[PDB]
Ligand binder design. Structure first.
Ligand SMILES: C=CC(=O)Nc1ccc(-c2c(-c3ccc(OC)cc3)c3c(N)ncnc3n2C)cc1
Ligand SMILES: N[C@@H](CCC(=O)N[C@@H](CS)C(=O)NCC(=O)O)C(=O)O
Length: 284
């Protein structure tokens, strides 16, 4: 692993704590980092640390390195989980990231189902994530794994995109290759990502529409009752999810535009941000 002093953090100033989540690419633990904020070199900050599991594979390590590099290239934004540092030399690979105390968005929403959530809160949540994707797209980055489970909520109820393990630069896609997009969850995936084996920002817009549906169902599971094996046939025939109850007609029409069959006819993240900003302002 090449040295990157800009992002390197000393191992002796990092103390691992309770585990936060345990998936399949790795594990995440809460930790205390002393001096991670360079202006406060003696203060210990609570952070999250992603590392490999004991049964990790070679691909797991390459995915973790790719995720680290992508978060280095992306840059800083209010609605993106902030990379804080990395332990990469002489020991296990640790990726140190900002700690979001309220967990992922799906559980956050499902827990606040009848501090209950209002319509304004859901619109504000959607606007924040639209902004986050607009910034990502401006950096020529495609997320490819947009979903409520991959959004984190901070103590101040700020929404952060996270889990960049599948994210790629817009030009770093093997177009029309049979293996391309094979590790994307099918119920959040744009049809062309599987029918044509391409991925653009308009594919992310589709996923964002699915994310919107998750948000206004307060954490519902997309395409309820429809197994993955039958979904894509129905999508080819024009099936789309019905309007959630807590949604306005205008927001559902926005979801359906995100789900246009023709990618170029879907809205861009900039248009989504403008429309959501108008809607959120009117709600005041
Ligand atoms: C199965 C695939 C998979 O990775 N799942 C998964 C997704 C998220 C989390 C996760 C994080 C988190 C997210 C991205 C990171 O990037 C290096 C680091 C930590 C986090 C956090 N920073 N603060 C509070 N809670 C958090 N959680 C729960 C754990 C497992
Ligand atoms: N691409 C090389 C290096 C990437 C890497 O870090 N691989 C891990 C597998 S867990 C390793 O220990 N490789 C042995 C080495 O560093 O030469 C490889 O996979 O062998």
């Amino acid at each position: 692993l090449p040295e990157d002093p800009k992002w390197e953090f000393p191992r002796d100033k990092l103390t691992l704590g309770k585990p936060l989540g345990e998936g399949c690419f790795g594990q995440v633990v809460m930790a205390e980092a002393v001096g991670i904020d360079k202006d406060k070199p003696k203060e210990a900050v609570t952070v999250a640390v992603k590392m490999l599991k004991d049964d990790a594979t070679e691909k797991d390590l390459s995915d973790l390195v790719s995720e680290m590099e992508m978060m280095k290239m992306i840059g800083k934004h209010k609605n993106i989980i902030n990379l804080l540092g990395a332990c990469t030399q002489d020991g296990p690979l640790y990726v140190i990231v900002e700690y979001a105390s309220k967990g992922n968005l799906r559980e956050y929403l499902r827990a606040r189902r009848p501090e209950q959530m209002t319509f304004k809160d859901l619109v504000s949540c959607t606007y924040q994530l639209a902004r986050g994707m607009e910034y990502l797209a401006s950096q020529k980055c495609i997320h490819r794994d947009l979903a409520a489970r991959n959004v984190l909520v901070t103590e101040n109820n700020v929404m952060k995109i996270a889990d960049f393990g599948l994210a790629r630069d817009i030009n770093n896609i093997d177009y029309y290759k049979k293996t391309t997009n094979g590790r994307l969850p099918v119920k959040w995936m744009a049809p062309e990502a599987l029918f044509d084996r391409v991925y653009t920002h308009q594919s992310d817009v589709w996923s964002f529409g699915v994310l919107m549906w998750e948000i206004f169902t307060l954490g519902g599971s997309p395409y309820p009752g429809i197994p993955v094996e039958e979904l894509f046939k129905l999508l080819k025939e024009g099936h789309r999810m019905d309007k959630p109850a807590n949604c306005t007609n205008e927001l559902y029409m926005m979801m359906r535009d995100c789900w246009h069959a023709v990618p170029s006819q879907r809205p861009t993240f900039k248009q989504l941000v403008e429309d959501l900003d108008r809607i959120l302002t009117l709600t005041t």
